[PDB]
Design a protein around this ligand. Sequence first.
Ligand SMILES: *[C@@H]1O[C@H](CO)[C@@H](O[C@@H]2O[C@H](CO)[C@@H](O)[C@H](O)[C@H]2NC(C)=O)[C@H](O)[C@H]1NC(C)=O
Ligand SMILES: *[C@@H]1O[C@H](CO)[C@@H](O[C@@H]2O[C@H](CO)[C@@H](O)[C@H](O)[C@H]2NC(C)=O)[C@H](O)[C@H]1NC(C)=O
Ligand SMILES: [Xe]
Ligand SMILES: [Xe]
Ligand SMILES: [Xe]
Ligand SMILES: [Xe]
Ligand SMILES: [Xe]
Ligand SMILES: [Xe]
Lengths: 317, 316
Amino acid sequence: LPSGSDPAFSQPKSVLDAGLTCQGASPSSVSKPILLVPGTGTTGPQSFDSNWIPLSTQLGYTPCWISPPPFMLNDTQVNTEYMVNAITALYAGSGNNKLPVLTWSQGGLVAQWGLTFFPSIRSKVDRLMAFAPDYKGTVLAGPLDALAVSAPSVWQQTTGSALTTALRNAGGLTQIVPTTNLYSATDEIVQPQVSNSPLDSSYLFNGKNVQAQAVCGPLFVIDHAGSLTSQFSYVVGRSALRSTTGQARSADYGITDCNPLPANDLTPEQKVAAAALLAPAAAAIVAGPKQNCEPDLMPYARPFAVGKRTCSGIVTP
Amino acid sequence: LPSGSDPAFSQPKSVLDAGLTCQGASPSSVSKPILLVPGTGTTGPQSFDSNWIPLSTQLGYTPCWISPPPFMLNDTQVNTEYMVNAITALYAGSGNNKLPVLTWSQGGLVAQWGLTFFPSIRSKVDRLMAFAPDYKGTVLAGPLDALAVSAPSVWQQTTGSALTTALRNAGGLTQIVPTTNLYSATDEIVQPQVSNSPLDSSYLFNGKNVQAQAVCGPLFVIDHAGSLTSQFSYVVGRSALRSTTGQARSADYGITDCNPLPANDLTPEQKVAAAALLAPAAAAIVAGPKQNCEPDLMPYARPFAVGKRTCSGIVT
Ligand SMILES: *[C@@H]1O[C@H](CO)[C@@H](O[C@@H]2O[C@H](CO)[C@@H](O)[C@H](O)[C@H]2NC(C)=O)[C@H](O)[C@H]1NC(C)=O
Ligand SMILES: *[C@@H]1O[C@H](CO)[C@@H](O[C@@H]2O[C@H](CO)[C@@H](O)[C@H](O)[C@H]2NC(C)=O)[C@H](O)[C@H]1NC(C)=O
Ligand SMILES: [Xe]
Ligand SMILES: [Xe]
Ligand SMILES: [Xe]
Ligand SMILES: [Xe]
Ligand SMILES: [Xe]
Ligand SMILES: [Xe]
């Protein structure tokens, strides 16, 4: 696990600040911030408007989010600069108090990538609550890569990629702060997830790894979006947020919570938007950047993926 | 469309017979057979054990398959001989009743090649259910081979080949029996497939052409193998086999069936094997025989590709 200096940002602070927003507040002065990190092909509001923005508010946080241009389709390493900058600002802006980080899809990857390579945030992040995170990426991105219709971060989120290799070799498949991972074997975007074991993309060693089917039964179905927005998700996320261990507790949820539909506390109109979460992401990925190779690893990550091939060639020792 | 007698087999009949196997039945006596034609780099069981062998069985058919050696990598015209022979056999052993044929990848091209050039089997094939068929071949060279160092059948499935030229010119890009073509814009082996229109390699004129994304939206992702194994592929497949017209019906599938993962009815172990269908197939292509030219068309196909080049040279 790297433990020296933070790598320098490739983006100016003014650029990284322009991608952070809080609801009803400036980040330099905010009460109880929760930082929300969005999925692939979405902004913060598109990922979280219909769910964790109002649900975290009702739990007493001030929701904050990053929206890395364009819609999280660019380099994951740069997306992480937005998060590291945001954590740093929210920590100070909230009286030097640690803050929770809550994520979906790529956002979990971005968060764990942050914790792995930017040691400074380790003492500023209270816990991690990750919904459907792809630490090992997904095999399903593969045919998109072969067709050269994959955005930079879609390449990076493909199993076997230089980036996911780098994360693994640096020790990032072990939790770095108290982490809860909620995911589903029936996730139609992120696979493999079927094992309820270290083989799963969403699994971290020593983490609170919650496969929906382990709680709700092997026949239970919940998809990629519902991993974030469901009633079941809410009860788990609330468990993780309220817990004094920093992880969700088994005693906090059970069979009566196993409802994959949008969380009960959402208004009917929010439920409609939540169910259709992936629609804006579909249009963004279709109109988004596409290339025929994986983006190069930043210098700090290269020693951990020697032999992998990116846009510029083989990563050398 | 070619009209006369069937062209003579280049292979002994007994060799072709041994390439046919039915699950639990002699070909001489089988109820409700369905013939499975496999993709490049596979045997019948390798293409279908994790999917349409058990899925057709639960639908009430007896699955039968052909396995032309070596792993469908040889001449597509010889691959076709196995299928023609198999159909003739299964038709008689089911009481002279027509039988459905269901195919993956090269399987569809083989099927349509047979229907185009072997007229005897037209009265014997009830319907064709082709998943990701490459009737136009593919424009994708791919990463498996050095360019123009490839298996016989890989040459033949390259867009612009003498064999795809011959198929088009013979009239074989029109459906010959009631045909359903299920395919995907996100097929990484066969392209073009993205337009939902006669531009796609899987499209047959008058056929029931089902491009998955046309029903499931642009980010519904199933690959060349997902085209065969997914829940949506199952639903469309089931419709085509049940339909009283021999083609899948739009009424039997819609948005709610849009699940890219392997068909629900498959066991957990089948789902794993089906999701992994491609890797060994690609490996047999990499590891297979290789040559620097497209095999020659048989005499029966040469008039339909005059000017194309093959191993012996230009077609006269
Ligand atoms: C998208 O990611 C690329 C690649 O990481 C970024 O390009 C780098 O940008 C920094 C600052 O402009 C430069 O100093 C680097 O030299 C660039 N590297 C390459 C390989 O291009 C780009 O800034 C990102 N774009 C957005 C909008 O975030
Ligand atoms: C692979 O295909 C080739 C070419 O179609 C087959 O070779 C022909 O076989 C017939 C019958 O033995 C001969 O009359 C021809 O002279 C052969 N032509 C050539 C170019 O070799 C071959 O039999 C096939 N191999 C297998 C194992 O199916
Ligand atoms: Xe996505
Ligand atoms: Xe984080
Ligand atoms: Xe994607
Ligand atoms: Xe999506
Ligand atoms: Xe056929
Ligand atoms: Xe060719």
